[PDB]
Design a binder for this molecule. Structure first.
Ligand SMILES: NC(=O)c1ccc[n+]([C@@H]2O[C@H](COP(=O)([O-])OP(=O)(O)OC[C@H]3O[C@@H](n4cnc5c(N)ncnc54)[C@H](OP(=O)(O)O)[C@@H]3O)[C@@H](O)[C@H]2O)c1
Ligand SMILES: NC(=O)c1ccc[n+]([C@@H]2O[C@H](COP(=O)([O-])OP(=O)(O)OC[C@H]3O[C@@H](n4cnc5c(N)ncnc54)[C@H](OP(=O)(O)O)[C@@H]3O)[C@@H](O)[C@H]2O)c1
Ligand SMILES: NC(=O)c1ccc[n+]([C@@H]2O[C@H](COP(=O)([O-])OP(=O)(O)OC[C@H]3O[C@@H](n4cnc5c(N)ncnc54)[C@H](OP(=O)(O)O)[C@@H]3O)[C@@H](O)[C@H]2O)c1
Ligand SMILES: NC(=O)c1ccc[n+]([C@@H]2O[C@H](COP(=O)([O-])OP(=O)(O)OC[C@H]3O[C@@H](n4cnc5c(N)ncnc54)[C@H](OP(=O)(O)O)[C@@H]3O)[C@@H](O)[C@H]2O)c1
Ligand SMILES: O=C1c2ccccc2C(=O)N1O
Ligand SMILES: O=C1c2ccccc2C(=O)N1O
Ligand SMILES: [Mg+2]
Ligand SMILES: [Mg+2]
Lengths: 252, 251, 251, 253
């Protein structure tokens, strides 16, 4: 058969490791041109060619909280592959503190990436992709932590709940104005990534059946494939909705 | 490559509307499919419209017919091998408020929309567990399992029941390592014979105060999310709700 | 001051557990109450333990008995005047997975937990609408109407049905200016005969991984949210879910 | 009933000088609590306090909820007036009528500093000051139906109210697991007749449409006051981490 992302041009923030890496990998596999971003250009450069050549994928150093860099990022992708059709706001960071124990510096730093960065990408994505008949799709990475609380992830919970509902606002406005832009959120449960790998004992803790009923954590390809569905015209009637891939975590 | 390679699917109410499109795309992606429905003429024309008996067959079965469910699995397994995928899609509607619902309307709708889904889920678990099939049970709920509608009280009850019963099954299958996943799909308004035969339904649900996109969906919109859920691509998705509704429930 | 001044309530299953405490605090806040139950000895004692026939009375009625509902409303109206408040609290449990649920068990539980709430809601709307009563229908769902339980498949179905059916009723009543509100209450684990008779249930649900507060609740915890919902204090609350669960569904 | 439902409680109500917060403060005092109300404008604030009672039951403190250092002084002042705080209502909030697309970054940061950072400051400090004291403490965070559904013209506000919704669950869980005797819940009003709504031209008419609020009218501040009384009272000792929606049916359809 045929490529499910034929002619799509996608920005994937934080697309050099973990979930964002797999999203970029499967996007290219389905016919899309991809620009991945990340802060470490060393790590980011080798990540880009691990997927493919510069005719299908490229890396652009960019901090998702860099508002002005977002305009340059859209310009660079546009001159490389054509008008952007797909924005995956995946960059995010974690902070292992209860609300009580969160410093204001930790709070502000996490939210600048996890919330302001997603806002910058969604806002500019709408401005740059509306009214061009592109079948445009903005995919905002929330989490199961946008649906349930966690006593030791207070700031993260705030950021992911914000992404959850802000995305609905954007989806509604785009729909009511016939912008031809959809906005949806993805809510992964625990996924084996560097973020999880570097937290001591995280995978074993979240493999408890009282946490993930399947008794194991997921893999980055599990999130890649739902983003492929959401970037594709297969999902042209899906907007403002929450897509949960979590091993049953939130079902109990 | 075929996203449903080696899968064997039962799609109830697969002769019209959403279920027909689910069947169509399941076959397109490499699955063998048995579709059901009450009317045999519509059913045989439906199956042949999609393919030959090597990929798709029709079996006359009312989803509320408990005993018929075991025959349906047996028939599907003889034609195609072990069932891997059950799409509990058969369902009916009743345009009545809770206040105005007769008890016979209540019982009739729940026998199909709730008992039928229970029969297929329960038997699907029994017949598919512990076989390494990457089994997937896809239960058709609705946006009406998430929000109320003042004129579809019994339907609301049935779809809310399917929503939460499916989470029970998903959890039990996961905790027991059954290799069976269970998820619900929640379509918004979709252009189907159900909607076409309801006078002025499409115009009403195309209002922006109802569906923000200003139009209703098409059966393929639901087929493609069911393809994702039937495939091994979704091997970490269970107990979850997949909403394809034009923004209806986002406002 | 009485928060339920002038109110006349039917509380089904009001002879033990949660329903008993609801009736208790309803009378305390000035309501006249009819409680129902199947065992007449327990029922007469429940009523006498709260007050005399001037404030509270017992009627033997099975919530699944459709014709009995009309007699129940008639009896209550003749005793205390027009019914203003209906608490559909009667419910039962079955400790079976979806896979292991017999159709007999499925039908038994849903006849009480779903059909009974339907009968009480449908008749409550008919009998209380358009009378300036500040009428309130309070339907007892559960945390098991919000999340799944691998060993309570039929119960999950029933409580999910109650959750969404109640929204339908709330919307119709609000859009038609019936002066009837409908809301659902979602208790977490509560110390009642239902839980006490289930061996090990309290210990299981007191685990921090189940109830974060580390203990289960008490009947008065649900009585007080029901007083709020029955009172005119909540005149703008309809179609909503009131969760009193020790944090169970917040994680 | 025959007893003050908030006997012995000491409450801080941010944004307690108009609208919803004023009604919360009013009914809190009626049920026997001592209250400190905050706001930015002292003229409004001092008049609001006197409209409810004397300094034996209610006082005004001028405080911007986004002002982190002032949160410490606010709790200090409240303790000196009334004793240990038992109840925190994070109600101060502002709005911005802009789609996500049209939201300036300045508008984004300004609204979130009040609606999100302010609720974080007050929740974090409330836990620190009320934990482990046997007070039956309760933190009530004012979200909205706009923390449950989107609004195409309130992008930043949606973000703030979704954040409040889920951050509050985190705090509820931590407090419960640690036996802090602090509950945390969110309240989600639908449209309520307040200065915020009265000053938005056409807002009440728009939200009174049956397609928005099925009851065909918007609510009143006492509607939110009474669910806050329930949440601050020991009547709700088993309620934590939950969402209390008082919205005329708005989110049920
Ligand atoms: N893993 C899970 O279990 C899980 C579950 C649910 C949701 N999520 C969410 O999924 C997303 C991906 O998480 P992950 O597990 O893949 O994390 P990860 O393994 O740490 O990867 C994060 C990626 O984002 C990049 N990044 C970090 N900060 C950035 C910034 N300010 N600007 C641009 N790029 C940045 C990182 O590159 P540099 O280090 O070079 O910046 C890296 O490429 C996050 O939003 C996370 O919250 C993860
Ligand atoms: N259309 C929508 O807007 C919409 C939105 C959300 C959810 N849904 C749900 O999606 C599912 C499909 O709906 P649809 O709109 O595609 O309906 P439809 O166009 O009326 O098609 C119904 C299909 O089910 C079959 N069927 C009806 N009763 C049956 C029974 N007792 N046993 C077995 N098969 C039966 C019908 O064939 P026979 O008549 O020959 O039996 C037909 O093939 C239903 O569960 C519905 O509730 C629909
Ligand atoms: N306890 C919990 O943890 C919990 C949690 C969430 C929800 N709930 C729900 O709360 C409600 C009350 O539960 P509970 O724990 O208080 O139950 P309980 O202790 O078993 O009390 C049940 C009451 O209902 C009556 N009853 C049972 N079947 C009936 C029928 N067919 N018709 C009329 N009355 C009937 C019983 O009296 P007779 O036996 O004499 O008829 C008794 O008065 C139920 O809907 C339950 O699903 C309970
Ligand atoms: N009204 C509704 O329909 C509605 C619906 C859902 C949720 N809500 C939420 O309910 C809460 C109260 O809304 P309302 O409609 O009652 O608002 P309102 O009528 O505008 O009253 C706002 C109150 O907050 C104070 N305030 C504003 N900014 C502040 C700041 N930075 N620090 C401290 N106090 C501040 C105001 O006093 P000063 O101006 O003197 O500071 C005033 O006392 C808000 O969180 C709002 O988001 C309202
Ligand atoms: O009936 C019950 C029950 C009994 C024992 C423990 C938990 C629960 C629950 O959540 N519901 O609804
Ligand atoms: O502030 C507001 C508001 C104003 C006017 C109508 C509805 C709303 C709402 O839902 N929130 O949160
Ligand atoms: Mg809605
Ligand atoms: Mg949970």
């Amino acid at each position: 058969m045929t490529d499910r992302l034929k002619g799509k041009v996608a920005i994937v923030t934080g697309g050099t490791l973990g979930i964002g890496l797999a999203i970029a990998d499967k996007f290219v596999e389905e016919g899309a041109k991809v620009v991945i971003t990340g802060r470490h250009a060393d790590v980011g450069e080798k990540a880009a060619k691990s997927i493919g050549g510069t005719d299908v994928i490229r890396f652009v150093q960019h901090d998702a909280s860099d508002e002005a860099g977002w305009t340059k990022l859209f310009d660079t992708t546009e001159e490389a592959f054509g008008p952007v059709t797909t924005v995956v706001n995946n960059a995010g960071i974690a902070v292992s503190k209860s609300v009580e124990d969160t410093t204001t510096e930790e709070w502000r730093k996490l939210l600048s990436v996890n919330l302001d960065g997603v806002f910058f990408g969604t806002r500019l994505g709408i401005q740059r992709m509306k009214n061009k008949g592109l079948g445009a799709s903005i995919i905002n990475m929330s989490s199961i932590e946008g649906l349930v609380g966690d006593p030791t992830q207070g700031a993260y919970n705030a950021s992911k709940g914000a992404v959850r509902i802000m995305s609905k606002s954007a989806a509604l406005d785009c729909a009511l104005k016939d912008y031809d832009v959809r906005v949806n959120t993805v809510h992964p449960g625990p996924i084996k990534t560097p973020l999880v790998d570097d937290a001591e004992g995280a995978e074993e803790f979240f493999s408890q059946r009282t946490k993930t009923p399947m008794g194991h954590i997921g893999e980055p390809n599990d999130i890649a494939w739902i983003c492929v569905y959401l970037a594709s015209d297969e999902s042209k009637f899906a907007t403002g909705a929450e897509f949960v891939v979590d091993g049953g975590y939130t079902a109990q």
